[PDB]
Design a protein around this ligand. Sequence first.
Ligand SMILES: Cc1c(CN2CCN(C(=O)C3CCCC3)[C@@H](C)C2)cc(F)cc1NS(=O)(=O)c1ccc(F)cc1
Ligand SMILES: O=C(O)c1ccc(-c2nn(C(=O)c3c(Cl)cccc3C(F)(F)F)c3cccc(F)c23)c(F)c1
Ligand SMILES: O=C(O)c1ccc(-c2nn(C(=O)c3c(Cl)cccc3C(F)(F)F)c3cccc(F)c23)c(F)c1
Length: 248
Amino acid sequence: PEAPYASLTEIEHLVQSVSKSYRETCQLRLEDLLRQRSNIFSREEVTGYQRKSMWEMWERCAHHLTEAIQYVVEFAKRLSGFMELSQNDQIVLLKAGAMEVVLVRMCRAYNADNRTVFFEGKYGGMELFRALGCSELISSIFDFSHSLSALHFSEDEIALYTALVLINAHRPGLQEKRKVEQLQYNLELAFHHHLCKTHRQSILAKLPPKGKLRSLCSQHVERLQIFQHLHPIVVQAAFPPLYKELFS
Ligand SMILES: Cc1c(CN2CCN(C(=O)C3CCCC3)[C@@H](C)C2)cc(F)cc1NS(=O)(=O)c1ccc(F)cc1
Ligand SMILES: O=C(O)c1ccc(-c2nn(C(=O)c3c(Cl)cccc3C(F)(F)F)c3cccc(F)c23)c(F)c1
Ligand SMILES: O=C(O)c1ccc(-c2nn(C(=O)c3c(Cl)cccc3C(F)(F)F)c3cccc(F)c23)c(F)c1
């Protein structure tokens, strides 16, 4: 619901529901990502990626980001109250928030011991993506993933945190702002309750500064839009109203 006086029953069910929605919309399960860390690209395979053209790497990365976004839209549609919002407000929250959630989820695929990331079956450093010529942007994404990875999120924590990244009533363009404030309030209450119950409140002060995630996503989507205008990826749109806002 979106109602006031949210009981302990509603709060604890909000936690379990959001956590269920999170794991059922993850392309890769956490145990498979952790188990694949020892599977690292050799020097000849990394050279194979570096000798691919700008457009071949752009096509690979863009198609995987398209899937990551589609999974996040499924996650958002499972959050209680979200599908009851207008199509305008759903699209306003997803346009800003969807890629911000993808950027947070990336910390699961980041290994801080050797600074590598999961990409197409194995782990590799940022040198793997040299043909794209986005070493400054990609270095920022590696840094943000490193800082989040040092928090050691549980599955409940990263699920609630990404739910609050989406359910934000301060996105410009919301026509039912009050209603999104009520959903955000209850998710904050469940997040703070869960952190307090599990003695994990110390992560609150370590969360990325408010504005850092929006700024990084802004630089990231700007670059993707520039790449899409020079070499358009053909997408079979799963959510055509949202697609229309980002592509046409
Ligand atoms: C692959 C990966 C990166 C590096 N990526 C460089 C290329 N890129 C660009 O956006 C480029 C920069 C502008 C042009 C494209 C992003 C995909 C980030 C960082 C990270 F923290 C996790 C992952 N693994 S992951 O498993 O989380 C994952 C794999 C593939 C995905 F698509 C999404 C996540
Ligand atoms: O074994 C312990 O040491 C222990 C101590 C406290 C809590 C605890 N219960 N709690 C409730 O809201 C609550 C209450 Cl008051 C009645 C029935 C059931 C609950 C439940 F946890 F299920 F919500 C909390 C809220 C915030 C922070 C907390 F730490 C708790 C706990 F679950 C275990
Ligand atoms: O209906 C669909 O299936 C669908 C799939 C992905 C998006 C999507 N793409 N996207 C990109 O930045 C992106 C990606 Cl991931 C790859 C190549 C080109 C782009 C471009 F930059 F052009 F939008 C987004 C950024 C924020 C919020 C989004 F919802 C998206 C979309 F809007 C709809």
